[PDB]
Amino acid sequence: KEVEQNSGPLSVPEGAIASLNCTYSDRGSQSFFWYRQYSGKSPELIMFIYSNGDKEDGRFTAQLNKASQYVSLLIRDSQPSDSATYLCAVNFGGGKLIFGQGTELSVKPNIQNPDPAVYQLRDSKSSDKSVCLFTDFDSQTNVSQSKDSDVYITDKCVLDMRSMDFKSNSAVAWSNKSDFACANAFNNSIIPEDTFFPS
Amino acid sequence: GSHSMRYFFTSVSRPGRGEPRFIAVGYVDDTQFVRFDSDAASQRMEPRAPWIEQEGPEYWDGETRKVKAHSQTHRVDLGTLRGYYNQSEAGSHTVQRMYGCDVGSDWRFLRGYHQYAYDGKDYIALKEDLRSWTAADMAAQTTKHKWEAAHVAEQLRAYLEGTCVEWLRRYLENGKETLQRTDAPKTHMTHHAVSDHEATLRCWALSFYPAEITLTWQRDGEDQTQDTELVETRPAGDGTFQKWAAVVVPSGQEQRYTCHVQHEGLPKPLTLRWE
Amino acid sequence: IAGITQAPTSQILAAGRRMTLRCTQDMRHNAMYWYRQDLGLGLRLIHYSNTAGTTGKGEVPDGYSVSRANTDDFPLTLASAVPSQTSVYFCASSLSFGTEAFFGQGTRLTVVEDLNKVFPPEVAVFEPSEAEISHTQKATLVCLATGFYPDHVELSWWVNGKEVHSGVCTDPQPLKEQPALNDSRYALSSRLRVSATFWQDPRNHFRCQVQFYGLSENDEWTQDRAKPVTQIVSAEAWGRAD
Amino acid sequence: MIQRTPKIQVYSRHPAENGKSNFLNCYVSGFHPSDIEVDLLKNGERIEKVEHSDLSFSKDWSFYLLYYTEFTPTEKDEYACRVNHVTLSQPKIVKWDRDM
Amino acid sequence: AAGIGILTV
């Protein structure tokens, strides 16, 4: 029937509180579940709740209000490995365990050095096969591909260099080959001031 | 004053290759409100009191699923209890489950329970604290370890303190005319002579609700423990109840005996005499 | 150690064919479930079973058969294979009805009407900029996986034969090569980033590895190219000092 | 095993009055196991349309049922309850007594 | 309403 979650995507900065809600139709529902799902993986249990009120488990607080048909998940002190789609499941009787649509949560890096630039990368598969890298921007910059069918831009991607304590935010772009420049690619969503196209 | 919600479940194995009879009933106080019967056409939980009829389809689909889930759990148990007790397949055997909650005058949680029987004898019961179990014998200790490991007590505690109580309250509001009503006993006395020197005086209490009643005989202001025949409280069929008490009385001395009726439907206790 | 296992992890079906996804559980759970997961619509219950011997229809039972002879096993079978059943499928179990459900590994399933348009990825390794090197003193290799259908792909980076989970991110979803008419082919990129000293050292091997899940070896293959099977297509770069 | 023989009472819903419509009851209780056959008798012949309550049980686990049919008592008609259970060697007949 | 904390023996 109806299990309904908070509309995502939820962008929440690192160290903050993230907040997820879930509503359900069945007043007689007796079992309530929060699940975590990393991309291309299985849901794994965060917490079950059976009774009205608060359930503490570390950085995770569950809240159940049966009268307004509400389940919630408060995520305190949010690490970058909390970045998952969150799943509410509600039991509608016997085997009718029904899930919400899922709220996608992405915990962005607290950026200690924002260094916006755009580079061009040559191939190992020939010398003329061309691609564009745009990296080290601060977390509040977003990405858009919507010019034409010429230029595909990927999503914003967060990588962690663990041995050097550094975080790089990046997105990749290419056309097949035409008079498509590297400077004339990342303009659909706006570049910063000193974005280096060094030539 | 105080209230209860009670669910009773019976599964009966039939012999050999043989599908089990399953019947579930639900009460509030002494009023039945729901039924599942595995012999009926619908295979759904069915209304038995007018105030439950108003419930939506999510309730009826929901309850049905749970009551089937009970039955199919009872089916596995029937196979398992055959193994635990070394019993052949040629016999018919019975599992019974009872649960529910009591509430006080304020409709706050008083006491919850969840008991289980195999072949009419105690198997395992949830204790008053709802944290723990009485296993009546050695197969039930195996079950006690399973249920302890599975946190079954926790789950039942959440149902008995929460869900049971919250649903009990909603039932008492929606059916307030029917369920919060008392029917005072309508009382009389009959007199049948049995020999030339002795007599039976029978004190009747009729059409009362709830079933809880006290009928006592006193002779000269003192409780007649002796010649009292006291029948089991019986239903009239209309949602009300009947009971009688009788005493054997030497003739001429019929006015020594008073019948005493206590029922919560009554303004004062009732005293009956043959005159 | 007691768990739930699903089988296979990925399949590509021709339309109309019958296919049975296995789900087996050691945990002595009474209850077992099957779900489908799709882009906007979360998890949807297909069928359930509260105990060994009994079943129940969920939210979306149609097209799907289910069976429960014994406690361990709950296989899900699909009779007529329509394209609308293209999804990811999750088997789960729970000790009794209404307790926590424990999920299996997941099955990626794509039913294709035409086996002509199943394609292996073309993989390239783009060696980093001179400009990136003399700015940040770090070096990002990227890797495109291009020209593939469907999106049954897994990307990994290998350095000198060893896999790494540091300095690396991959696009969360594959990107469509022409988001328009008919079932378009997909593209996927990933970045590995390490220091300039690690990069300019010529004794360092770099490898972008794409595991694409393709056809079964029993299928009707007829056309131009090689059989678009389950294959690893890799691409390489070494350390350049220029 | 525990097997318990049924208690039986036969009675009317409303105090009995000749010519007036009523319900005749047979209440069976204290029995185990649950299967049981209960007839209502009119001059020793089986009454055909007889309805019954849904099976429930007591806290000591033993079962109860109410069997019933519509009747109009007269002075000359005899009424009975006929009960069969696995604890009985043959069915047991308890006669209706208006004047309990 | 009926329960969900009920498990095979």
In this structure, what token pair is assigned to residue A56?
A: 């503490």
B20 and B133 assigned to the same domain:
yes
Task: Map tokens 């049995």 to a residue.
Answer: B194
* Number of domains chain D contains: 1
Q: Is residue B144 part of a domain?
A: yes
Q: What type of residue sits at position A137? A: F
B59 and B87 assigned to the same domain:
yes
Cβ count within 10 A of residue C17 = 13
C54 and C136 assigned to the same domain:
no
3-state secondary structure of C45: strand
Q: Which residues contact C229 (CB under 8 A, 6 or more apart)?
A: C214, C215, C217
B189 and B119 assigned to the same domain:
no
Q: Which subunits count as partners of chain D given 3+ CB pairs below 8 Å?
A: B
What is the Cα–Cα distance from C184 to C146, expressed in whole angstroms? 12
What is the Cα–Cα distance from D91 to A64, expressed in whole angstroms? 57
B31 and B104 assigned to the same domain:
yes
Last-in-domain residue among B181, B209, B227: B181
What is the Cα–Cα distance from B43 to C81, expressed in whole angstroms? 32
Burial label for D78, CB within 10 Å (0-12, 13-18, 19+), is: exposed
C196 and C231 assigned to the same domain:
yes
B177 and B221 assigned to the same domain:
no
E-strand spans in B31-93?
31-37, 46-47
B139 and B234 assigned to the same domain:
no
3-state secondary structure of C240: coil
DSSP assignment string, B250-264: ETT-GGGEEEEEE-T
- E3 with B147: Cβ contact below 8 A: no
What is the Cα–Cα distance from B254 to B256, expressed in whole angstroms? 5
Q: Is residue B275 part of a domain?
A: no
Looking at residue C152, which CATH number applies to its domain?
2.60.40.10
Long-range contacts formed by C162-169: CB under 8 A, 24+ apart: C164/C192, C166/A160, C166/A161, C166/A162, C166/A163, C167/A159, C167/A160, C167/A161, C167/A162, C167/A168, C167/C192, C167/C193, C167/C194, C168/A159, C168/C192, C168/C193, C169/A157, C169/A158, C169/A159, C169/A160, C169/A170
What is the Cα–Cα distance from A150 to A169, expressed in whole angstroms? 24
CB A191 within 8 A of CB C203: no
CB B36 within 8 A of CB B23: yes
In this structure, what token pair is assigned to residue C175?
A: 């990107």
CB B201 within 8 A of CB B249: yes
CB C121 within 8 A of CB C143: no
- Of all residues in chain E, the one with the smallest CA distance to C97 is E4
Residues 45-84 of C with CB under 8 A from A: 45, 48-50, 56, 58-59
C121 and C206 assigned to the same domain:
yes
3-state secondary structure of B142: helix
D95 vs B: CB within 8 A: no
Count of helices and strands (H, E) across chain A: 0, 16
Half-sphere exposure of B272 (CA within 13 A, CB side): 23
In this structure, what token pair is assigned to residue C81?
A: 């294979």
B226 and B161 assigned to the same domain:
no
B221: left (phi over 0), alpha (psi -120 to 50) or beta: left
- B73 with E7: Cβ contact below 8 A: yes
What is the Cα–Cα distance from C67 to C76, expressed in whole angstroms? 7
B67 and B193 assigned to the same domain:
no
CB C142 within 8 A of CB C155: no
C83 and C190 assigned to the same domain:
no
Cβ count within 10 A of residue B176 = 11
C53: left (phi over 0), alpha (psi -120 to 50) or beta: left
Domain that holds residue B192: 182-270
In this structure, what token pair is assigned to residue C156?
A: 């990994």
DSSP 8-state secondary structure symbol assigned to residue B161: I
User: Of the candidates A59, A113, A79, A83, which has an alpha carbon nearest to the alpha carbon of residue A11?
Assistant: A83
DSSP 8-state secondary structure symbol assigned to residue C73: B
What is the Cα–Cα distance from A99 to C76, expressed in whole angstroms? 19
Q: How far is CA B233 from CA A93, B230, D28, D68, in A?
A: 36, 9, 12, 17
Q: Which residues of D touch B232 (CB under 8 A)?
A: 7, 9, 29
Q: What type of residue sits at position B54? A: Q
Burial label for A128, CB within 10 Å (0-12, 13-18, 19+), is: exposed
DSSP 8-state secondary structure symbol assigned to residue C215: B
B235 vs A: CB within 8 A: no
* E2, containing H or E segment: none
Q: Burial code of C165-191, b = ≥16 C-beta within 10 A, e = fewer?
A: eebbbbbeebbebeeeeebebbbbbbb
Residues 152-211 of C with CB under 8 A from A: 154, 166-173, 175, 177-178, 180, 187, 189, 191, 193-195
* Number of domains chain C contains: 2
Q: Which residues contact A10 (CB under 8 A, 6 or more apart)?
A: A18, A20, A103, A104, A105, A106
In this structure, what token pair is assigned to residue B147?
A: 């249920």
Whether there are 3 or more C-beta pairs closer than 8 Å between D and A is no
What is the Cα–Cα distance from D29 to B130, expressed in whole angstroms? 30
B70 and B166 assigned to the same domain:
yes
In this structure, what token pair is assigned to residue B81?
A: 């209890």
Domain that holds residue C102: 1-113
A51 vs B: CB within 8 A: yes
User: Of the candidates C18, C15, C150, C1, which has an alpha carbon nearest to the alpha carbon of residue C75?
Assistant: C18
Looking at residue B16, which CATH number applies to its domain?
3.30.500.10
CB B123 within 8 A of CB B140: yes
The sign of the torsion formed by the CA atoms of C130, A169, C212, C177 equals negative
Q: Is residue B72 part of a domain?
A: yes
* A16, containing H or E segment: none
Q: Which of C51, C56, C99 sits opposite B73 (nearest CB)?
A: C51
Looking at residue B266, which CATH number applies to its domain?
2.60.40.10
Last-in-domain residue among B181, B206, B240: B181
Count of helices and strands (H, E) across chain C: 2, 20
What is the Cα–Cα distance from A93 to B60, expressed in whole angstroms? 10
DSSP assignment string, C127-140: EPPHHHHHHHSEEE
- A26 with B62: Cβ contact below 8 A: yes
Which among B45, B46, B95, B96 is the top mutation candidate for probing chain D, defined by the most D β-carbons within 10 Å of its own β-carbon? B96
B53 and B5 assigned to the same domain:
yes
Domains and CATH numbers, chain A: 1-109 (2.60.40.10), 110-199 (2.60.40.10)
User: Of the candidates A34, A172, A49, A171, which has an alpha carbon nearest to the alpha carbon of residue A103?
Assistant: A34
Beta-sheet pairing, A10-13 with A103-108: parallel
Q: How far is CA C67 from CA A91, A97, C34, in A?
A: 22, 18, 11
B12 and B79 assigned to the same domain:
yes
CB B2 within 8 A of CB B110: yes
* B68, containing H or E segment: helix B57-84
Last-in-domain residue among B166, B181, B196: B181
Last-in-domain residue among C113, C138, C154: C113
Looking at residue D33, which CATH number applies to its domain?
2.60.40.10
Please report how the helices B138-149 and B57-84 are oriented relative to each other, as an axis angle in degrees rounded to 10. Answer: 130
Task: Map tokens 């009826």 to a residue.
Answer: B60
What is the Cα–Cα distance from C21 to C10, expressed in whole angstroms? 10
Q: What are phi and psi of C102, to 5 degrees?
A: -110, 130
Q: Entry resolution in angstroms? A: 2.3
In this structure, what token pair is assigned to residue A181?
A: 């420049």
Task: Map tokens 């399933």 to a residue.
Answer: C109
User: Of the candidates A170, A182, A104, which has an alpha carbon nearest to the alpha carbon of residue C189?
Assistant: A170
Q: Which residues of B touch A94 (CB under 8 A)?
A: 65-66, 68-69
* Number of domains chain B contains: 2
Cβ count within 10 A of residue C127 = 18
Q: Rounded to a whole number, what is the largest CA-CA distance in chain B?
A: 70
Residues 113-142 of C with CB under 8 A from A: 124-129, 131-132, 135-136, 138, 140, 142
In this structure, what token pair is assigned to residue D36?
A: 């049981």
User: Of the candidates C53, C33, C36, which has an alpha carbon nearest to the alpha carbon of residue C97?
Assistant: C33
Q: How far is CA B97 from CA A93, B122, B145, B187, C50, in A?
A: 19, 10, 19, 36, 18
Count of helices and strands (H, E) across chain D: 0, 9
Q: Is residue B126 part of a domain?
A: yes
C85 and C8 assigned to the same domain:
yes
DSSP 8-state secondary structure symbol assigned to residue B24: E
- A93 with B166: Cβ contact below 8 A: no
CB C183 within 8 A of CB C117: yes
CB C71 within 8 A of CB C47: no
CA-based R_g, chain C, Å: 22
Q: How far is CA A106 from CA A12, A21, A78, in A?
A: 6, 16, 10
B172 and B202 assigned to the same domain:
no
User: Of the candidates B150, B173, B171, B169, which has an alpha carbon nearest to the alpha carbon of residue B161?
Assistant: B169
C33 vs A: CB within 8 A: yes
DSSP 8-state secondary structure symbol assigned to residue B62: H
DSSP assignment string, D5-18: PPEEEEEESS---T
